Symmetry: C5
Subunit: 329 residues, 5 copies
């Protein structure tokens, strides 16, 4: 039916004359995973191409479109799109190649395939875990400049569809939209580039329960010391020390999970402030023991330091929390 | 024998006329693994196709079916099934391609191959580890709409078989059955989709032994304090503190294993209630030490708080357990 | 030399008449690894096939066998064996395909290739780490039933050889032997299946040193308390508590390594019995402190409980060990 | 258009006569990751080749360059570059091979492809984490010596371009430049080799916060003991011991991350000096307890050792820090 | 130029007559990694073959050798070497296949390719970490026996070269040399096998610092107890106990890294002897407390046990160290 043997499909339609227009539309099937340590994300999608080539015309009375096996795709000419700034990708091939080819009697062509992509995404963690991130996937022709191929979204803003099943356990996904821009390479020329854009917002529940609450509880334990008889030395001393040494484990277990960035994150601030609050309660009792011993040496109830600490330490931590959750909301 | 050179197998049987019927049946060989963190499962199966094509007719006197080498599959036309919402898959190929082709003299065809698939499955953990999950595998044609190909289960409900060796160490597997539904894609049309469905139920033994019992034992240790002379300050204080700090390790070691979901799981409730029970026993002894010191200051046996605590703490935990195992059964 | 262009090698020798006999023999090169968590093992082997096809006859005066390049294997007919219940496999291909083809003037054929296989193996851990396991590798034709192909061991029990270098660091390997059985698939028919069988036995040394000895040592530490003056409250109390909290770490570190099976293992029994032995020593001293305080209240040496405990705790643990190593030998 | 059928492209242009000149230029798209444990780095780049072959001449009136499909690359002759001392690499192939071919009417050729490479890099850690490292990527022809192929940078120092998005979370990247050298293989001859060179500098913030500060804080805790009444034996003893045992955990957690090199790193020096400072504070109190007991035995305030230690320990650590940060800056 | 179309390259040179001689030489580019847990090593190398085939003769006046594209390798006959006892391997293929073919007018051939190999190596750890290991890589023809192919080192002992950059962070590499031996397979015959041999020696610095020193320091801490007043019960008891419990962590952290072999390693001996030294110091103080209490009961300074222990424990450990480092040097 199609006269494949008659033509040289090493050359594009319109070769040696004006540029060929190629239109694109897309459906996203899933957003698969995200990594802070690698700074990337993985996506699976259906991708579709539209153009005309009169070398593929055939006669019929119905004027309708026809589907073909799929092994012909390797004989005819086809556009050459690639995913810019991507780490790895593949086309699915069970039970055969997941590819589709449809042709109309006047030579209009529709071409479709299913792919998975892993792509680069630069991330800012200064407000982590209360952060928002924005991401994009980039599409471009490899060999042909804007003088030979013209690339555009087939139906404007209606060219992107999304599966209703798409979900991530840790993020809310929002704000899917598409854009276009021109790109330049010094050695080879000017090219059209298409963009798919989206926004992510992290759920904080896990971190409250797993990090902010146990820090708070250690700080509240350190306050119990102020209500204990100053003469019980081997009770008041280890009560302070053990909370210092627990807080260090909390601080380590958080930071072991994240990339080694050169700046402070919002969670770091809270934990190190909590640490100094606990550390100071140890110096307070050392002072009261020393001054008691000086009183014994002069001579030979509750101390004013204890009396004031019962008031000052809790007020100060409440003030800190009010400020912190006013800044990070 | 088969006249392969005579025909154009880029076109389906019946091309330009009504739809071709294709029937399917399946045997599951193994259910290989499951992941909560990735929310997916892996399956290995045998998959079979049935249709008629008169271009493959041949003469004989016996009217019986004949087997062919397998290299012909790439010359003739074959249906184009794919696994919807799948992450990855392959066809096995040692010592050769695991593929089978059988043909009858009137052109009826049977085609079979062996494959492994990894597929998406959305999971709810609000009742974890006492949870039940349900799963499915989806099958569809890639290129041909219901106007060109008709896809159905070959023998109704008898079209699914399962290997007697199938097992998972952590789940009971039940309720294998099959269904059908129509699907729509905005750019390309309507398609028939087949479903394989099944249910999983988790064994709880591991979690009892590994999580609920040691929490319970920490709570019971904290009660020993109420039976110890109130004057033994450096004994009663670390006895409380060490149980607080152990309970925190238990809570961490559980949640380190699971995905970071935005809601509370049934195991979380038990551990955090156990934590407050242990935390309160520390505040109780602080109260008794303070009131004893006030009595010393006024002046200058067992305390009523100890007397009551010996009764109230164990009753309250028993009431909690009765309610919890009434809710989660 | 071989008349490859004359014949249609899509059809088996004897096509449309009786079954073709194919004989097999094997040499194992290595048993590569084993996993309890995945329940599988990996093996590398040489696999060999024997049959006659008169379409490959050629003339000569010597009556001897001749070797050919290996690229012909893809032109002639070849049997279609596959490994049943396998997870993955491949054929080696550096510096070329590791394949061999030898032919005699009357058309007898010898065919050989090198492969690695990973295969399923169901494991029972009720006696772990003192367990024994048994395993097998299964071989079958994919497309041809016993009416068209007949599959058998070429030399009976002498058909399996094993490399003298084969070893595993954790298991003793024994009892290599071969068997045969018929298999049935509802949709497709009856098939011959060959079996390779073997037995494994675990070395216990590592577990003695790494698990049973340190548990025993914690139990013996808890006994020291009975020899310490009952008035040293802040010594006798933490001596008990710290052994409880160490034993919990031992119990966790063992079970973190194994699959989450729904039944108790032989190592679990020993560790939880050791735990209750340590837990009871804490309740004993609580009793002696309480009764001493009652004596003080009445009034206002070694206690009989201490005196008896020095005898009863060690006897009871020795009785337990005698029973346990009588059961698990 | 191109007369591909006329010629034998198993032979280079100029075969049997002088060497063919081939020019190269490059753009780096990303520097992907780095490993101290494996001593390697990964890079993604665009690579371009320039030469003349009159067998590819064609007629035209415009004198302009033309682009071709990409399937012709496998028919014509092409240069044979490889990455020396590399571990693994690949060429990208979705949605097709990422390859470009452009030809001028006189037979000048431009050829381009996109690749990812992982390459060897020897690292020195004697100053870690305050270290600087230098790296290079090497390019060479596999089959052709300088007598048959001449390889050079196409535009001198202007032949290397870099993407403005390139970044690493842990390193500052600097000093990209290119060089050339001749190489010799004993069995096969002399070859031209091109070099891409660059420098890395590590950010220290993470290590200050994660390692140097908590060590310092343990040392400062050990000093509190000198301010506590010498008669409080069960307070002063565990205060020392617990800091010893914490410092050991710090030392372990650092070195667990790095390769097992045979020499000391700058971080090791700081932690082991901090350890002896803490260890000595335990021997000091043992001395004061012993001498007090001798005074009791003779007989039957603050001790001079305490008085001096309050001065000497902090001065000595401050002197150490001044020297250390003078050496490592 | 080469008459490739004239001949049947499914047959070796000399087919049906005497054996063809094939010579080999090698250059090692890198030794990439080593695993105790898997018992294997990885190597990257250049491998070269030499033979004569008159079917490849061509005319010329210069009598010099000529290089060809590389796509011809798949048309002509080539030898069939494989790596015996190997786990996996591949040939590199960016930017094309890393393969070289050179031919002289009389039909002498040189053939070369670049490969990476992972190979089996049995290891003995009885002296670990002071151990020495020896390794080899094995090379053989797959299909052809010594009656058809003769395989030898091309230049005797001069046939192996090594890159000056080769290094491992944990081992000293020494003693590279080559050997030959004949091998027999029962079903198929006799074959020539070539060997590459080498020796490794481990650096001990890491283990001294990471394992032997901290054990020693725990033992020295336990000795402090002997210098402390026997009446300070709640000081002397936890001082012993905490060192016992630290030593157990040291023992665990070492053995978690290695394979589970059925015999004792040299590091195990040192750590378990150190453990009993620490354990005995706890029983000593229990004895002194008991005998003091008996003296109190009879009645109703430093004890001789303390006096002697100050001398005996350190002498005994010094004697142990002298013996141990005399045995393991
Ligand atoms: C198809 O084209 C024919 C003319 O060739 C026209 O009559 C018919 O309406 C067209 N149908 C559609 C659906 O565009
Ligand atoms: C979609 O369409 C509108 C037309 O109003 C144009 O603003 C815009 O670029 C598109 N929106 C986005 C967010 O890209
Ligand atoms: C096969 O077809 C023939 C007629 O062509 C019929 O006589 C015979 O019964 C059929 N056999 C089966 C098993 O259907
Ligand atoms: C199988 O067959 C029945 C007919 O009674 C129909 O209910 C059902 O859909 C099938 N069952 C399920 C559970 O899909
Ligand atoms: C090979 O066959 C010939 C007859 O064709 C016979 O004489 C000879 O003994 C046979 N040799 C072997 C080894 O079987
Ligand atoms: C090997 O040969 C014997 C013949 O005595 C038969 O018992 C047996 O099946 C084979 N042995 C095993 C263990 O399979
Ligand atoms: C191309 O070549 C023609 C002569 O063949 C010359 O006139 C023209 O200037 C050239 N153009 C460029 C851009 O080099
Ligand atoms: C680039 O160009 C200069 C010419 O001044 C030459 O020094 C140098 O080799 C190049 N620079 C480097 C750093 O390689
Ligand atoms: C090559 O062979 C010719 C004879 O054919 C001889 O004269 C010449 O010396 C040889 N050259 C080398 C390098 O062997
Ligand atoms: C290399 O050559 C010598 C000849 O003296 C022979 O001893 C030896 O086998 C070779 N050496 C080794 C170590 O294999
Ligand atoms: C102690 C944790 C407080 C968390 C406050 C969160 C406010 C949205
Ligand atoms: C940008 C730094 C914010 C620091 C706020 C501290 C709140 C107590
Ligand atoms: C303390 C754990 C109790 C577990 C109860 C389980 C009831 C099925
Ligand atoms: C849906 C929340 C259940 C909470 C029950 C608490 C049982 C004590
Ligand atoms: C305390 C461990 C005893 C191990 C006994 C093993 C007997 C074979
Ligand atoms: C089958 C259970 C065995 C339990 C034996 C307990 C030995 C003390
Ligand atoms: C205690 C850590 C001091 C860090 C000093 C860093 C100077 C650049
Ligand atoms: C090259 C060794 C440097 C050691 C300096 C020590 C600084 C206190
Ligand atoms: C306490 C460790 C001693 C290490 C001695 C090493 C002798 C080469
Ligand atoms: C072969 C065993 C060596 C044991 C030596 C022990 C040295 C104290
Ligand atoms: C901005 C640096 C903060 C450091 C807090 C310890
Ligand atoms: C640890 C500091 C104490 C100072 C008391 C005046
Ligand atoms: C003290 C906690 C209050 C913070 C409110 C955002
Ligand atoms: C529903 C939130 C519960 C939180 C318990 C700490
Ligand atoms: C820690 C709180 C104690 C309050 C006693 C009245
Ligand atoms: C107190 C435990 C009883 C719970 C019964 C389900
Ligand atoms: C058979 C169950 C045993 C449980 C021991 C805690
Ligand atoms: C902890 C239980 C003690 C009971 C004494 C009679
Ligand atoms: C008390 C240990 C003896 C057990 C003998 C098998
Ligand atoms: C150069 C060796 C230093 C060792 C410090 C413990
Ligand atoms: C631990 C050493 C103490 C020595 C006192 C003279
Ligand atoms: C005492 C810290 C000062 C070091 C300045 C580099
Ligand atoms: C040879 C066995 C030694 C065991 C030491 C605990
Ligand atoms: C723990 C053993 C002590 C024995 C004293 C005679
Ligand atoms: C006491 C350590 C000396 C050992 C010398 C090899
Ligand atoms: Cl105490
Ligand atoms: Cl601890």
């Amino acid at each position: 039916l199609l006269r494949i043997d008659d033509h040289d499909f090493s050359m594009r339609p319109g070769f040696g004359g004006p540029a060929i227009p190629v239109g694109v539309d897309v459906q996203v099937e899933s957003l698969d995973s995200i990594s802070e340590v690698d700074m990337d994300f993985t996506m699976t999608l259906y991708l579709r191409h539209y153009w005309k080539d009169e070398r593929l015309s055939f006669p019929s009375t119905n004027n309708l479109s026809m589907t073909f096996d799929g092994r012909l795709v390797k004989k005819i000419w086809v556009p050459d799109m690639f995913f810019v700034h991507s780490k790895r990708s593949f086309i699915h091939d069970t039970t055969t190649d997941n590819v589709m080819l449809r042709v109309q009697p006047d030579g209009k062509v529709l071409y479709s395939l299913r792919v998975t992509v892993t792509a680069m995404c630069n991330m800012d963690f200064s407000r982590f875990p209360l952060d928002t991130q924005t991401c994009s996937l980039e599409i471009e022709s490899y060999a042909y400049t804007e003088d030979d191929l013209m690339l555009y979204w087939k139906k404007g803003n209606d060219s992107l569809k999304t599966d209703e099943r798409i979900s991530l356990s840790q993020f809310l996904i929002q704000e899917f939209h598409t854009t276009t821009k021109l790109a330049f390479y010094s050695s080879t020329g000017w090219y059209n580039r298409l963009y798919i854009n989206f926004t992510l917002r992290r759920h904080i529940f896990f971190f409250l329960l797993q990090t902010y609450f146990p820090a708070t509880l250690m700080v509240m334990l350190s306050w119990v010391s102020f209500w204990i008889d100053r003469r019980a030395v081997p009770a008041r001393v280890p009560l302070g020390i053990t909370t210092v040494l627990t807080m260090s484990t909390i601080i380590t277990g958080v930071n072991a999970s994240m990339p080694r960035v050169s700046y402070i994150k919002a969670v770091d601030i809270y934990l190190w402030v909590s640490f100094v609050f606990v550390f100071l309660s140890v110096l307070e009792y050392a002072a009261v023991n020393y001054l008691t011993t000086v009183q014994e040496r002069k001579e030979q109830d509750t101390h004013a330091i204890d009396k004031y600490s019962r008031i000052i330490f809790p007020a100060a931590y409440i003030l800190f929390n009010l400020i912190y959750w006013s800044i990070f909301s």
